[PDB]
RNA sequence: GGCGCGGCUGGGGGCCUAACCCUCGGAUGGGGGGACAGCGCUUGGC
RNA sequence: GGUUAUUCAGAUUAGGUAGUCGAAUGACCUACCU
RNA sequence: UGAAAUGCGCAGAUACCGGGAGGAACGCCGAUGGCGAAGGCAGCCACCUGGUCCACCCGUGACGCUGAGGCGCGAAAGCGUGGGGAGCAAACCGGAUUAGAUACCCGGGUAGUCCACGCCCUAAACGAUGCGCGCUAGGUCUCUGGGUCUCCUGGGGGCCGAAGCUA
């Protein structure tokens, strides 16, 4: 899986305040991580349609959140789009 | 007629090496003998055959032997 | 060629026809006999009661090699099977034993159209 | 997998042509004790004894391994994989640790990198090679010799390869590319695993031109000739073989065999 | 690094001296993918359900051990390459089930 | 008509190597094949 | 005694078809349908 | 096989023992069982990976529901290139049944079935029941999770039935 370690690390690096563990801003870089790896792994695993699926949903819930956080807070989204480093 | 769970102590189900605990699940010809005749639970018989499976490859358990005097 | 007291005799049960093999303890075949070479033909050949007969004529010549004792194995889901073994019995010969080893595919080749019957 | 073309000409339509990315970016073949003056036609009189060849591509010949025991435990580094003009294979240019540099059919899997070894000590992996009384049975391994200390023959067309079956005495069992089952001998040579570009039967030539680069010229048919020529020789209007159909020589072609019964390879085959 | 299970059979009819050889080997390969083995129970020879390579018995071996979960699958292709091997097995390994406690 | 023995064996199986054949950083040798193949005379065929 | 071909005379049918079945003569040795 | 015949068999078959190859499918566990959006998924081993349920009530603060078009998946059959090919098996051949039998039964048999990649995009693709959300008796067994635990609590799978709906 992912390291449960790491995990902390991209919770951490994300996150208005200690704790916070679910901030829009975490989620989606939390989530991105989950991303990234699925799709890198079906990169190679072409014929694995099934787990796209879900990587369908990933890319779909981090979606509905990055709208949400561009609609609530411009400022604080431009910045996690490019930390992160995503719409292309 | 006699429910193989009554029938020994405490044991791990999920070894699968304790040959002599195994065999007392299988039958007089290898069959990996029914629920109504182990009385385990759904959770049990599982993880169990899963293992007696496991067993055979090694070759400790048998797959099948002949049906004998009828 | 040789005789033997121990032996080993195999039934083969089938629907259009029964028959047994005697063979020495390695397994080489002394004789054997089948509903056809008792006299019969096709459905006929299917009767326990040539099943009878053939396990004796069988175990009857097997006897004239010396033959004793004949751990028994059948194979065949047959309709004279026991019967078989009946005639083994009253054949006048020890049986050792009596085994199944009659064969079954752990779920391997697809089967002709008619034994398609699972599903 | 294989180079396709937009039509934007006829024949080219058709035609594709291999991707040489598994080409080390290397033109240049090792000059060193590696090319060599190659030519030829037909026979040593002056006579044709192999109908329709000739012309098509300038080629120079490189020399390759095919003993490989002349080096034994002494590893080398795969230096690169070349072009070869003149086999279906593509070829490796390995550096050995010593400083000698030989060439060695490039075999499926291959990188540019890769240790490598021959001899009986040698690890089962890709690329070495070693003797067949040690080669796990099972194994694919190919160029292959036949009788031992003396070359490989068997599978080093592109992307060919045989099995073991089994070993049996001072022979093992093989199943040749043809499918053929034979006793080779133990101490027989053999690099492990597949040979190379795999990818080759899937050209297209494509065009006429194209078959003629490649040295084979224009054939034709016996139906197109005339009686002194050719067995079907009644040429009068497009017409049936007048008989069981025959080479230029006359001999039948339809499925005659020719193998000599009393050949001594023959105990030796199964299949 | 998960820990695993590794049992392994060996040629039963097999002499101790040859055995030597082919224990290390599983030593050393275990240790050529860092196998840093646990525990272990070389539970001798033992007769087997069905002759395997037509012999009744078969030498055990089972090599507790944490190591690095992606060369797992290939620590197996190399046990399995010696013949006088005749059945690696590896597993993951899981806490115990009791039954009928 | 049957057991034991040697020359003669004829057939069939197996193994050998040294003829003969292939091959190996040139070898009075190593390896592979092997009394086969190849070749001579001869038999009948297509 | 057997085989085959045909035919109408019956027969089986509620009836028809066809068939089976029977007979004659020449040659020869249960199915469908209304 | 209804009984047969074609078929195979003295050139030695069937039955039996040993040895070998190869392909396909996974007996017993198995189920009124589970999982998945659907198609669908079953020996064992690892690896990579999707979804889902429960506990704690810690985090964000309405970020939701649907969804034309789009995009993906999509049983079997079928198509292309290349493999593979045991058993089965349209087409095909033969035997028999029949008035006839291009069928049912029998003997034989090829694509196909299997794999890789690419395409096809249909179905009784069925629960013939769009998805989400809140409302409105209980009884019974069953899978799975939590809790001092002859039972409460959550999530699935069933049968019987309050009211109510219903031709
Ligand atoms: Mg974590
Ligand atoms: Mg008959
Ligand atoms: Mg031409
Ligand atoms: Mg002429
Ligand atoms: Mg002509
Ligand atoms: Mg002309
Ligand atoms: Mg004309
Ligand atoms: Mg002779
Ligand atoms: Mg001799
Ligand atoms: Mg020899
Ligand atoms: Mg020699
Ligand atoms: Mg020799
Ligand atoms: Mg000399
Ligand atoms: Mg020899
Ligand atoms: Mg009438
Ligand atoms: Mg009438
Ligand atoms: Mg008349
Ligand atoms: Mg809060
Ligand atoms: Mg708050
Ligand atoms: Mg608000
Ligand atoms: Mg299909
Ligand atoms: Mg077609
Ligand atoms: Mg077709
Ligand atoms: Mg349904
Ligand atoms: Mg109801
Ligand atoms: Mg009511
Ligand atoms: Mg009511
Ligand atoms: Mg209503």
Known sequence: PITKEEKQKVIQEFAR???????????????????????????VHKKDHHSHRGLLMMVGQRRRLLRYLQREDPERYRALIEKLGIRG | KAKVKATLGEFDLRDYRNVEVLKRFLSETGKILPRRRTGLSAKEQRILAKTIKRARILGLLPFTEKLVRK | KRQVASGRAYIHASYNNTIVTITDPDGNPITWSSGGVIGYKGSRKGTPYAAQLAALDAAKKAMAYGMQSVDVIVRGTGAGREQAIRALQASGLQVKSIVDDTPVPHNGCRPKKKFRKAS | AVKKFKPYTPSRRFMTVADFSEITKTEPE?????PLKKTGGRNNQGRITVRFRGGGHKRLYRIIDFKRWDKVGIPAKVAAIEYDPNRSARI??????????????????????????????????????????????????????????????????????????????????????????????????????????????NIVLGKAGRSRWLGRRPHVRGAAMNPVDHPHG??????????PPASPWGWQTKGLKTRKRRKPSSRFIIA | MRRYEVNIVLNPNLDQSQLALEKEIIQRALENYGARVEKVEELGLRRLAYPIAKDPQGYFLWYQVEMPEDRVN??????????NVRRVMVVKSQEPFLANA
Do not use: M, W
């Open chain 4, 234 to 243: 009644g040429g009068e209007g497009r017409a049936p073989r007048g008989r």
């Open chain 4, 92 to 201: 490796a240019l390995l550096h050995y640790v010593d400083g000698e540099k030989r060439y060695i059919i490039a075999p499926d899997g291959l990188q540019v990198g890769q240790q490598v070894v021959a001899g009986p000590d040698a690890p089962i992996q890709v690329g070495n090679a070693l003797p067949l009384r040690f080669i796990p049975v099972g194994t694919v391994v190919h160029a292959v010799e036949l009788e031992p200390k003396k070359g490989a023959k068997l599978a080093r067309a592109a992307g060919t390869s045989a099995q073991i079956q089994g070993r049996e005495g001072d022979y093992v069992i093989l199943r040749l590319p043809s499918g053929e089952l034979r006793k080779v001998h133990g101490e027989c040579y053999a690099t492990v695993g597949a040979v190379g570009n795999a990818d080759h039967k």
């Open chain 5, 74 to 83: 290939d620590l197996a292709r190399e046990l399995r390459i010696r013949d």
């Open chain 1, 17 to 43: 305040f200690p704790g916070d563990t679910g901030s829009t801003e975490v989620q989606v870089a939390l989530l991105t991580l989950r991303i990234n790896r699925l799709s890198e792994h079906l990169k």
């Open chain 4, 30 to 34: 090792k000059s060193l004790v590696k």
